[PDB]
Structure formats: structure tokens, C-alpha cells
Write a structure and sequence with these properties.
The structure holds two protein chains of two kinds. Chain A has helices spanning 86-98, 113-118, 123-129, 147-151, 177-182, 185-197, 200-217, 220-234, 241-257, 263-266, 269-278, 286-295, and strands at residues 2-5, 13-17, 20-24, 32-36, 42-48, 51-60, 67-72, 77-82, 103-104, 138-141. By secondary structure, chain A is an alpha+beta fold. Chain B has two domains: 9-163, Prp8 RNase H domain, palm region (Nucleotidyltransferase, domain 5, 2-Layer Sandwich), CATH 3.30.420; 164-237, Up-down Bundle (Acyl-CoA Binding Protein), CATH 1.20.80. Classes of the chains: A alpha+beta, B alpha/beta. The complex binds 4-cyclopentylcarbonylpiperazin-2-one. It is classed as splicing.
């Protein structure tokens, strides 16, 4: 297990860790989060009590360094930082643990939710989407735009998701205009999988990362990317069986975790109805179709 | 974006534009089979591509062989249309290529957009105008060349004959759409109006009769009467 200590909590804030949320009061004796499962990426996230504007947070992996959180009263936000003095860090964490000033990452015997939401997500790939090479962790917030949104503005603060555009020369082979538009297999398998992502694991990782940025920060361009990556698969007539089976599992856990109350703004009615009922893969996503029909039948 | 009554004079400005109408590309007769099932037989069709400013009609004849062994022909027909318009554009000198292409049916937008990706500066637009270009096959000389084609062929016409010597393109388009609307509403009567006077003929190099200005005013009123007549017969008014 690993630990993300907090220097202090000077402003009242709702703190997220992965799929959990908890409240810290202004100047409450809070010094961090312990028992964080090694082996996964994690996200620690924030929504200030006095200005819900800007959810923000940090993607990190405890295997890569010793990280802590410290409020900056000038920039007005909780910042992640790396402590290079490993003995200083271990000494700090131990004191805070001895004084029980840390909330424990829950350990649940019957739940594998976070694994199932981050199975293909790697810190190395997050750091290529979120470019800030001098840190081992990655800052994301509500307002950050994607490279694709920026083509239709600060390049340093952008989400560099892979651009997917169905009416683009990359998507459509000269002389196969009808074929490629109505059956996106070429774009999926040759352009994206073989060409850009190299394998389906990297494709799923970006899809999963996009969903989590949509859900945890309300990041609109992230929701657009997540739906585009689903639609590209569902709109391809030729998809390897293992990718369809895995996609069904990925989406099932994503729909399962979605706050019931946010489905109106996180789910695109057109994409979902197309994917489940009209697309080539309309009969290949049994688990996802079942949870969608029982959880959000209005959307359909 | 879309073209409608608010931006109608744009049709006659000096930016090159084309209307594309696909309603006569895929044409069939429905009939009974010996077993008493139903089957279609395709007949030759045409793409109706029109410069409203100049009258230049690019009539791409769609021969029935293009459907042989193909499935989902009504969908294929939109893509074949976009394929042929894109080929036409590429065949034109740069300074003749359109700045906008207006499709008369919104189902032509994505096919044409996809085929024109190489031309990002050509706007592909719908329209809220209900244009009567389906009636193009009621013009005898166009119907003749389509039905006689034995192979794919492009034929060029001026659908305005020599009217632009005497009237503006706005007025010429107004006449053309009134004639086509009438041919669409009651073809027999419209042709009777157009051809009831043997002394007014259609020149070999023309599509419509050689009416004087005063005779066009008469013809144009008879066409409006017919459209109003049929409107009464239709709704019992
Ligand atoms: O992060 C935490 C942990 N908590 C839990 O474990 C509650 C929430 C769902 C599981 C029971 C709430 C306190 N904060």
C-alpha cells in the first residue's frame, strides 16, 4: 500500500480518490490518504466548497515517486508535488499515520471496480495525452480543451487525445468513399489500431481515460473522445472478437459506475442508440445493452 | 449553411455555384412476376447539375448497367451521384469549379461531403427551397437523350435557351421553376400550353419554344392558372 500525505487543508473542499468522494472542512486536521493500492493508476481530485467551478485533479502512480498535496494560497488550489527526500517523506507519513490523521483508501472484498475502469490505463500513456514532462503526475480539470476542440486555445494546457474524425481524408480511402464511410473497419483496424495505437490495449486505455476525465471533471471534450472511440468500433463491420468482448466489459463497468443523476449530460443519446440498435455491433454488446436498458431506458 | 428565401439573390451573384438534384438517378418500374411476386426493372436515369446563373446543365446520364449486381440501390444512388459530381468538379478548370454546391435533398449532404474532402474550400449546402427539378424528365429532349443512352454519358445543355439575352438570371430561374412546377403538377396540360400553337416552334438547339416576350407573359399566366387549377382540383377549393 502507498500514501499521499497532505501538508494541510486550509480550505473546505470535497476530495475525490478514484471513485470515492469525502468532505474536508476548512482547517480540519486532515493529512492525506493511506492504503492506496499499488498496481493501478489513481486520480486524486478536488471541488472547492466555495466555488464548484473547476473540478481539478491529478493522475498519478505511486510506483513512480513519493507524491504529496499542498495548498498554494497564491494560485488558490491544492497542488501535487514530488518529494525527492525519501527519508523525509517516510518520516512524515509515519508521524501522520501514528496520529491517525489520514482517511483510509477502502479495501472491499467483493468489488473490482477500479481495476475494471483502469485495466488498460497506463501512466506513461496519460503523460503523452497530458503534456508536462517535468512532473511524473498529470493535472486535469473541467475546462481543459482537446486538440480536436482547438482545431474547430493554449497548446500547453490541452488534452492531446488521438483525433478521430469520420469525415476526414484519414478516415476515407480514395475510391472507397461509400464503403469506408458506411463501414469504418479500415479506419479502425488499419489507420488507428495498426497505425497509431499499435494495439487494442492502447486504444482501450485512451477510451477508459477519456471516460474517467468526463465523469470525474465534467470535461466535455473527454466525453466527446469517449463516444467517438465507441462509435468507431460499433460502426466497423470487422472487429476482432476479443476486442468486442472486452469492449462490452469496459462499457458495462463504465455505465455501472456513472452517477445515475449525471446520465443526462454524460451520455450521447444518438451514439448510444446507434451503437446498441442500428450499428454492425448492435448484437455484440450483451452486457452493456442489458445494463443500459435497465438503468437508463429513457435515453433509449 | 442552408439556402432559403432569406438568401435567394445569392443564387445569381458572381460566385460559381451548382444545384445538384438526384431524384431521377435511380428510376424503376414496379411490376408483377409470373409467380405473382413484385419486382423492379431499372430504367436509365440522370443527375441534374445546374448553374442557376448561367443556365449550364451538366446532365450525367445514369445507365442501368451501373446497378447490375449491386445491392441497396437507393443508397448506392446517392453515393454514385456524389461520385459523379466530384468527377465533374475535378474535370473543370480551377477557375470554373464551384465555390458552393447546393443539394436539393438533405440525404445528399454526407455522400457529397465525403467525396469532396479533397476540396475543403467548396461549401456543400442544403436548401429549404422545394425545387421542382424532378420534373426535368418532362422536358422532351432531356427525356429522349436519357432513354436512348446505351452507355454512361454526360450531355451539356443550357436550360434557359437564349433567355439571358433578354432577361436576368433571377427572372430566368423564376420562369424555369414555374415551368417545371407546372410540368410536375399536371404534365399533360403544361405541355399542351407549351405546344398548343404550331406557329411557335422549338429550335433544334433549344429546349423550349421560341416565345416572344409578350407570349412568355401569356404562357407564364397560363402556367400559374394551371397550378392554381390543380391546387383546386386537389384540395376541392
Ligand atoms: O474514501 C472514503 C471511504 N468511504 C467509504 O469507503 C464508504 C463510501 C463507499 C464505501 C463506504 C467513505 C469515507 N471516505
Amino acid at each position: 500500500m502507498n500514501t499521499v500525505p497532505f501538508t494541510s487543508a486550509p480550505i473546505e473542499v470535497t476530495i475525490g480518490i478514484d471513485q470515492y468522494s469525502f468532505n474536508v472542512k476548512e482547517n480540519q486536521p486532515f493529512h492525506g490518504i493511506k492504503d492506496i493500492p499499488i498496481g493501478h493508476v489513481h486520480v486524486i481530485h478536488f471541488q472547492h466548497a466555495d466555488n464548484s467551478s473547476m473540478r481539478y485533479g491529478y493522475w498519478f502512480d505511486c510506483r513512480m515517486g513519493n507524491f504529496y498535496i499542498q495548498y498554494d494560497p497564491k494560485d488558490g488550489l491544492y497542488k501535487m508535488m514530488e518529494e525527492r527526500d525519501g527519508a523525509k517523506f517516510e518520516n512524515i507519513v509515519h508521524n501522520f499515520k501514528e496520529r491517525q490523521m489520514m482517511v483510509s483508501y477502502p479495501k472491499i472484498d467483493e468489488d473490482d471496480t477500479w481495476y475494471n475502469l483502469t485495466e488498460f490505463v497506463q501512466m506513461d500513456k496519460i503523460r503523452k495525452i497530458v503534456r508536462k514532462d517535468e512532473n511524473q503526475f498529470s493535472y486535469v480539470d473541467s475546462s481543459m480543451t482537446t486538440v480536436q476542440e482547438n482545431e474547430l486555445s493554449d497548446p500547453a494546457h490541452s488534452l492531446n487525445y488521438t483525433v478521430i474524425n469520420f469525415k476526414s481524408r484519414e478516415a476515407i480511402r480514395p475510391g472507397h468513399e461509400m464503403e469506408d464511410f458506411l463501414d469504418k473497419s479500415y479506419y479502425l483496424n488499419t489507420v488507428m489500431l495498426q497505425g497509431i495505437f499499435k494495439n487494442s490495449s492502447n486504444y482501450f486505455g485512451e477510451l477508459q481515460f477519456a471516460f474517467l476525465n468526463a465523469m470525474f471533471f465534467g470535461n466535455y471534450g473527454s466525453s466527446l473522445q469517449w463516444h467517438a472511440m465507441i462509435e468507431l468500433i460499433c460502426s466497423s463491420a470487422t472487429v476482432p472478437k476479443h476486442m468486442l468482448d472486452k469492449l462490452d466489459e469496459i462499457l458495462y463497468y463504465q455505465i455501472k459506475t456513472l452517477p445515475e443523476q449525471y446520465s443526462d449530460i454524460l451520455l450521447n443519446e444518438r451514439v448510444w442508440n446507434i451503437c446498441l440498435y442500428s450499428s454492425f455491433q448492435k448484437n455484440s454488446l450483451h452486457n452493456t445493452e442489458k445494463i443500459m436498458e435497465n438503468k437508463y431506458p429513457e435515453l433509449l | 449553411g442552408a439556402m432559403n428565401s432569406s438568401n435567394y439573390a445569392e443564387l445569381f451573384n458572381n460566385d460559381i455555384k451548382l444545384f445538384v438534384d438526384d431524384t431521377n438517378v435511380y428510376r424503376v418500374t414496379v411490376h408483377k412476376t409470373f409467380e405473382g411476386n413484385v419486382a423492379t426493372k431499372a430504367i436509365n436515369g440522370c443527375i441534374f447539375t445546374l448553374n442557376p446563373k448561367t443556365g449550364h446543365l451538366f446532365l450525367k446520364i445514369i445507365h442501368t448497367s451501373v446497378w447490375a449486381g449491386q445491392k441497396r440501390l437507393s443508397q448506392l444512388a446517392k453515393w454514385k451521384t456524389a461520385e459523379e459530381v466530384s468527377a465533374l468538379v475535378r474535370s473543370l478548370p480551377k477557375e470554373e469549379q464551384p465555390k458552393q454546391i447546393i443539394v436539393t435533398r438533405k440525404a445528399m449532404l454526407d455522400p457529397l461531403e465525403v467525396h469532396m474532402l479533397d476540396f475543403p474550400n467548396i461549401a456543400i449546402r442544403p436548401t429549404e427551397l422545394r425545387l421542382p427539378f424532378s420534373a426535368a424528365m418532362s422536358i422532351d429532349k432531356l427525356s429522349d437523350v436519357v432513354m436512348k443512352a446505351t452507355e454512361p454519358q454526360m450531355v451539356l445543355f443550357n436550360i434557359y435557351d437564349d433567355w439571358l439575352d433578354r432577361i436576368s438570371s433571377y427572372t430566368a430561374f423564376s420562369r424555369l421553376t414555374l415551368l417545371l412546377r407546372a410540368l410536375k403538377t399536371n404534365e399533360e396540360s403544361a405541355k399542351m400550353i407549351l405546344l398548343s400553337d404550331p406557329t411557335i416552334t422549338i429550335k433544334s438547339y433549344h429546349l423550349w419554344p421560341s416565345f416572344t416576350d409578350e407570349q412568355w407573359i401569356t404562357i407564364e399566366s397560363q402556367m400559374r392558372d394551371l397550378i392554381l387549377t390543380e391546387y383546386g382540383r386537389k384540395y376541392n377549393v
